[PDB]
Design a protein around this ligand. Sequence first.
Ligand SMILES: COc1cc(OC)cc(OC)c1
Ligand SMILES: COc1cc(OC)cc(OC)c1
Ligand SMILES: COc1cc(OC)cc(OC)c1
Ligand code: NA
Ligand code: NA
Ligand code: NA
Lengths: 639, 639, 639, 29
Amino acid sequence: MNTRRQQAQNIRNNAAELAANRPHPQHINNKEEYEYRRPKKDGNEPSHIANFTKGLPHDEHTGLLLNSADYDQFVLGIQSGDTTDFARTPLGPAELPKVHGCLSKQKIDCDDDHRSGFWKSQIAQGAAGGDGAKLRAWESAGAGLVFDLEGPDAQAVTMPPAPRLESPELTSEIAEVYSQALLRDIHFSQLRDPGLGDQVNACDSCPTQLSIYEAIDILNTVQIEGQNWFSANCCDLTDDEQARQRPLVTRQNIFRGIAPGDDVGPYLSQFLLIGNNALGGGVFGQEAGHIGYGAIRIDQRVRKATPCKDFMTNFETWLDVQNGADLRGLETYVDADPGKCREFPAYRVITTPRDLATYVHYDALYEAYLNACLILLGMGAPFDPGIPFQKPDVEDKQQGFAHFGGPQILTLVCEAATRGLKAVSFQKFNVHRRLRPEALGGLVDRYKHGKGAGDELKPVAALVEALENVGLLSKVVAHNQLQNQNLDRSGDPSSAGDNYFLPMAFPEGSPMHPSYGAGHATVAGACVTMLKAFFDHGWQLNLGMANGKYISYEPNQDGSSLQQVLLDCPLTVEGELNKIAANISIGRDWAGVHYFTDYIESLRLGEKIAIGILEEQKLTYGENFTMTVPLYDGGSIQI
Amino acid sequence: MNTRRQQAQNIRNNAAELAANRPHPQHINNKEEYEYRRPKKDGNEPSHIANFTKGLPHDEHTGLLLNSADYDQFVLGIQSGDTTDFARTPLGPAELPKVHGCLSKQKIDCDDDHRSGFWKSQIAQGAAGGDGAKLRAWESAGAGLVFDLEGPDAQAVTMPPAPRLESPELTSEIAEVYSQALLRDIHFSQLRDPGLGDQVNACDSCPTQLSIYEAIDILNTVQIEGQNWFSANCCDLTDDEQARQRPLVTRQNIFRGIAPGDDVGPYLSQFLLIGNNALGGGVFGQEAGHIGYGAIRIDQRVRKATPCKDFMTNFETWLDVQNGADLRGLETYVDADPGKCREFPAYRVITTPRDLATYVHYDALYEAYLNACLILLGMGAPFDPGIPFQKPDVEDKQQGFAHFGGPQILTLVCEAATRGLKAVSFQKFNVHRRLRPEALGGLVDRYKHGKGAGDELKPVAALVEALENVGLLSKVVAHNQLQNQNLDRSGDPSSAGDNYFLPMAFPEGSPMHPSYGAGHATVAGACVTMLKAFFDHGWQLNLGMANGKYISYEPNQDGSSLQQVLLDCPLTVEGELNKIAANISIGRDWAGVHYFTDYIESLRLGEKIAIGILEEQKLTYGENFTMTVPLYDGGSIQI
Amino acid sequence: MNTRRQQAQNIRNNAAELAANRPHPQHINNKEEYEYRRPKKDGNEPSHIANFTKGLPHDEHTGLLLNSADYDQFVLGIQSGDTTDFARTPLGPAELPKVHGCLSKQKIDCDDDHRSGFWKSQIAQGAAGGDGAKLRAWESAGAGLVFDLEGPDAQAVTMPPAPRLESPELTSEIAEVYSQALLRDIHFSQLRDPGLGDQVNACDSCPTQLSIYEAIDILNTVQIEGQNWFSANCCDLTDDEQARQRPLVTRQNIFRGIAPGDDVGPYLSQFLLIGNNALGGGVFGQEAGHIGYGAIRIDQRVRKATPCKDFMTNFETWLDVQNGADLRGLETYVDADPGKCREFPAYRVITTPRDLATYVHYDALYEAYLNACLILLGMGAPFDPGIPFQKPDVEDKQQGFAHFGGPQILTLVCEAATRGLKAVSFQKFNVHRRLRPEALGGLVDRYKHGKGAGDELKPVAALVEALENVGLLSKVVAHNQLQNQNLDRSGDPSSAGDNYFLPMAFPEGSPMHPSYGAGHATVAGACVTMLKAFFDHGWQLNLGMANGKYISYEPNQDGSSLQQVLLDCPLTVEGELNKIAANISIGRDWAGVHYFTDYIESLRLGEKIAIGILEEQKLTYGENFTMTVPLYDGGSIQI
Amino acid sequence: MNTRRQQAQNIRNNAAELAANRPHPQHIN
Ligand SMILES: COc1cc(OC)cc(OC)c1
Ligand SMILES: COc1cc(OC)cc(OC)c1
Ligand SMILES: COc1cc(OC)cc(OC)c1
Ligand code: NA
Ligand code: NA
Ligand code: NA
């Protein structure tokens, strides 16, 4: 034998080498960054239209990137990871320099007590209680450079190159995000086959410019150079594309994930709706929506943001946000009904995607998957049989606590997320720098308003044709017109004219970090992988039965309680863990701050981080068990 | 420069060596294990009265350990960590062998469908719906042997030797636990100086055999060989004892922690009571008790266990539990009032220690400290200034997310706990093996009933004198008599006679692992250390003001809402994080499953695990900031 | 220079590092193990219907797995590799425990002199000369854990995930195995295009329920969810599936391998039929069937098992074998004709697949490929020109013996097999644990007899539909009925009713180790790879010519001698080494103990082991030659 | 425990050293 100090030190050095050995893949992007050129006096320069430029100086009249030098500075700051270099980047409204190539002069500084004059939108002008919206900087630019003690390194895993502005995939993805924005106040019961049960409409019925049927029709129709994304056969697509490609849009599979058990049952996962039976003598059931959070409860009722209210629907509102206008928590919420109990309808069940957008808006990183973990523990879910001390207490004469009990996993789901966020923070800033759906939504408007210099916005031409040829843009301008009749933005000049901008669920829209590499999806992909690995992934959730059919739950018309959907087969631990993983990830697409490619590839990335952690941790345990980890791409891996 | 693979691998090898270098202290116990001898035919053998023997064969008439060979087998199973050796240990009711030295024959096996006949208590006889209580094994016996990737190793830190049966300290600690058991249904408002505000009595007023005043009087009076624990000067005590020693029991400091800000304000920490203002346009305030859990809420209302109802109050009930009788969740809870909202009083605010016992009974490992973290985040707490990107967003041109934001800490508190549980699981099983307060409570009864062989229970004689000479036992027998009038245990023979057993808050009492090294306190000590380190520990929590005094909260008489306590100075982030750390840890002492020494030394251990993790993780970050970590023993360390 | 000790030690350390560096792939299965659930009192549990459970307690009435705890124990024994844990697994007929979760009580033990009463079948009841069949344990469970000095490690290579019960592939594979069972007594001349020569029928003509034409028709027709395996285009299939996929079943390519030269010429390889010319003055020719085994001969005549006699055709016979009933060598063989020479027809030429099943039943591991090696050496085959000292003896002034002669390869083919068997023994037990074709054959019967609990056998429903919709099952029940008229199993109750069981060529059917990872195919893939690498793979075997066409051989109607098949082009060393590799591997499919996926993926695995050995051994030789190794997937690699 | 790659590589290096250690006798004609 060795002394423990030696044994312990080796396990950490063994884990360190194991991680170093595993394939270190090469980071490849779509090359759109320096490809798309725009005119300057000496010649053509990079436009960076396809790139994330939110926070940088945006032309206050044109609406596009003011100076390319700010982007050149912005990149060199990320690549360096230097606090000095990244703070030399101009941020927010800025004036062009007199000498070409020089960095733009920042308008707002540490001597501006009042900032009202710098914003062209009313919402931003009277944001900070009359003073005017503050500037906000880029969130975790050099977090991709930060190392970790467990799991693979941030640059030891990669995501394949993103869709392009001219690609058929991208055109269908933005069309999906546009469709989701107009279906933001649809009742979740609508997003499934009607054979499952009677569907309902949201109690707060309001002006709708698009229906669920039209969205399916449009997504299957939309095509670039006579090719639709879903219709395109395997031969035409690349290896990295074939993996992502989906089938014809169905009423069941619309806006859903592509992992096992996503299509099965209602749209929304049970773990976002159901709770547990009240601790001890059950006062209420699982339909209650109160999770068994040890002794106390977790209320599953999300805050209700004012139905049918979108933001950044005109040029001024959009531009200001793209100039890092800090408009966090300026959205309005429904006041409570004094008569009703449980703060209703101020807090209600997730009825429409509007509520799912509100969920992912402020949710804690592991909250969604910790809650899912707690429901399974409270329900009494069997763990992956491979785990030791799983037999009867009398026979095995051992019980699972610290290393093979509830406590072990409760932390594992939390651990994985920070390992995950660092890994993707690299892909977002250092590698791809893909623009946010809102930014692309801007280009469509800017192009259709014939803005930009010479042939600057020529790349997006092909995209805008396809969207208008399926008559999607025709509805977006009609929707935006009604949204601009609101007193908060009616004073904004651009309200008068037509607006092709993507309606945002939040006033500030997306965060201050690039699109490709979803922060929510990487945490999801990592967290539920740990849950699936630890738990018995197959375990059919028995929520009772009614008339020889398995009971499942979804919101009711006003979100008062859950409504029964009776299925042929029951829902598994995996299926609902795979479905919640989609709900939170795709939930950002409903808000209009992510694409589909952002979800699926981040979900694959997060999984590799999670597996990597578990692989390294198996050196510690001396039992030499096995963990069956089901992958999102069919079959399962043994750990 | 190096390639990242090399850089990354070094940071993990550097962290691995750093941990190996830090002092590896020597594990020293009180030696009570093999000291206390009892008579056999050939001569004297180890009694193991001072040791944890819960689960092993206990003499069904005598009430003590049946065969020492079972303990000799039990130890060798722990020391080996072999699944085969630890499963060769006899568990539950057992028959003595015919050959002396041979292991006892187990009564209950995998052919006993019905087990009613093996239990001497009624509760256990009709436990498994008439079949009879199942056996339960020892939780994480070889978790102290399991290694880890971050933080110090399980055997790379130690806890000093526990109090002894003859020691003055132990006598005052069991007297504290006995007093807490009779004050289990006292209103928390009572546990503080009356100058702070008007105190109240619990709405469910019932038979009380001890008052708050008597408890203070008794704890200051109680003494062994003419020396009281609190009265004893520094000269008499050892270095390991001097650190633990407390002052004269005061109305303010009674049953509280000994960390900075424990004595200040009410007994119960704010983070167990208050929530946050409702997300967006606040429908309710912080007095509501709804935590800002992202978009959804966490209800601070704990399940109300039937007031003034204790368990293991007679020999039969106690013995069966000590024979690993699985009586989990057999305690009764109050049914809801149909008229009242928010499942009242089924779920209410933590009014009496009965509710704090119910909290720690089922609480998730990091729940208590995650909730505390969420309240601080929702309140808008400043982080430790040392952390980078803390300046205005315009000036610094960066924001904290993955590495120096909310997400970073949310996981850190969860990470630490599993690292902590393994470290103490060693101290519990492998090193000390100190008996649970219930086990000692048994010895007092067994001795006072003149049971045991010859001079077996002579060691506890001195203890039982001190408790009876302050007239504590005189009240315990009177309390137990009333508790044994309950129909569930009135049929049990020993109900007729006097009972000196410690009343347990749970039917199964303590878990199936030794006392010394508190599972709850090690997680607390580790978790809040991470919170204090990350957050600005000094930050005075401003919960408003009333009539020129700082507002603090505590439960009201029935637990309907929070009641205002107006303080001279306000409560800090540290003080309330140190107070909740005590509440959850000492909460087990109220249930009667832990001592004070179990809390304080585990709190010191947990802190060393937490600091150890943070020290190792600082190699990853390239910013080379500093974190100020305030210790429970006064001054702060810089990381 | 260095001293040899140093040089020699380095070559072994260099080889050791080379193996460690080569990609270590991740072991991924179909996840069917814990997916397919079945009902218990508390809820759903793993059925393990898709898993290998042969030897474990099988329900004596139901016919399925008795207790899942036995499987949970069986796995943990494999994963541990502990002699103690794997011997704690219940084996054979067993009684369910009284306590749920506890391991089943074994019926047969070391005090059962007579075991007749424990078997429900007559064959097994009077097996051990009246005493009754003995139990047999699992063959090499922890051989996948055993390391090796040359070649890659057992877990340093992997096999892709197996077909699923719901998959179109699996349905066509079991249909192929079912078809092979009814074509088990077809003359091998039938399994090729009639343009090659006049085909014949087996002299022992008997009841046939399926024809060669019907088998082709059925295999092309059979389909799940309107998709046939052979018909399915590349787009629908995965990367791991596309590699395995075959074309439309042709008379030439039916039941054949998919390596170069498999389809060319007759079904059966020459090396299973032909010998060499008698040493010195040839008394006989190569058509004789006497191999030039140095000075003595190897008779190519295989023992003739009684034509048209199958086993495990009813529930009792099947169940007993699935309960590890040791029925080895209870099959009957044809008695010799006293008049005829050369023990005829007791030993005859491999006429029908019945004989090829008998060959692979008892064959030595490398026998089939050593014999093939000896025929090539005796024929005078040129070695791979790359090998040194290959030129005329006068010019080169050297000859190949120890390092580049006949002796070198003779051992190489033998060496590779043990390296191969360990590699697959991991994939069988530790990774996949795929059920044997007989086990699946059972599920079809059990389902069609409406057995199992609730929705246990729902997964196989889809499979059984496809087989019955092509009218394959309709013939299987008719075939089984005639087989159950035999006096040995006519007394068995289930003989009266219909039987859907897969007819087994052996009484004991498959061995006691899981299906996926063929023991025969891994040895084949490894052995012939060494032969192809060493020999001149291209070398056209000249067995004379007749009427301007190249002569090839196949069995005659009674197996008296070989019959001439005249080809357009001659057969190569590679083609016949690739064809014998299939014959022995697919030979197990004819017996009904393997699928096609078991052959092809094991063939690919075995090749990687063989290449790995040769790569490591090239460090030893100082000549620095090259070896051209043709792969089964087209092109050749240089060593 | 170690990962198999490490365990496997050691067994081959251990075998290689074991052979090198065993007496290397002198070749006399
Ligand atoms: C989900 O990502 C975030 C979005 C935010 O709103 C702009 C703020 C933030 O800081 C905690 C994180
Ligand atoms: C707090 O420690 C525990 C106490 C328990 O009740 C016996 C069960 C347990 O398993 C999760 C842990
Ligand atoms: C081909 O694999 C085997 C099959 C056997 O019959 C059950 C026995 C065996 O032991 C040598 C090996
Ligand atoms: Na258990
Ligand atoms: Na900030
Ligand atoms: Na020669």
